[PDB]
Structure 1
Amino acid sequence: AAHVIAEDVKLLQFHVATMVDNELPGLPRAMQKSGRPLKSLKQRLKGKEG
């Protein structure tokens, strides 16, 4: 069904997105089990500790 494949491409887009940037403004955080947020490539590069 077209709405299922739309939702699945939307989920693929969300995962490829949160691989690069897990600090998106309008979307949920990608998380491990126990709920901690995943560190993305951007968070690896960004800050004083990056």
Structure 2
Amino acid sequence: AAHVIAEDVKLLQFHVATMVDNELPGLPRAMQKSGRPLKSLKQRLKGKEG
């Protein structure tokens, strides 16, 4: 169905975004099993230990 394609491309949107930028407001943070929100590119470049 068209709604299946829409929700799946929206999910892939979310995954590409959280690959690029994770700290942005609104969407939930992509996390591994058992906590530990994964270290995206912002978390690797910006800040003290970046």
1:4 matched residue in structure 2: 4
Shift of 1:35: 2.0
Aligned length: 50
Q: Which runs of 5 or more residues in structure 2 are unaligned?
A: none
Q: Secondary structure at the match of 1:37?
A: coil
1:45 matched residue in structure 2: 45
Shift of 1:22: 1.0
1:2-49, Cα deviation, whole Å (9 max, x unpaired): 111100000101000001111120110100000210000111000011
Report runs of 4+ in structure 1 exceeding 4 Å deviation: none
TM-score of the pair, normalised by structure 1: 0.92
User: Which structure dedicates a bigger proportion of its chain to helix?
Assistant: 1
TM-score of the pair, normalised by structure 2: 0.92
Distance 1:10 1:33 in 2: 22
Distance 2:6 2:35 in 1: 26
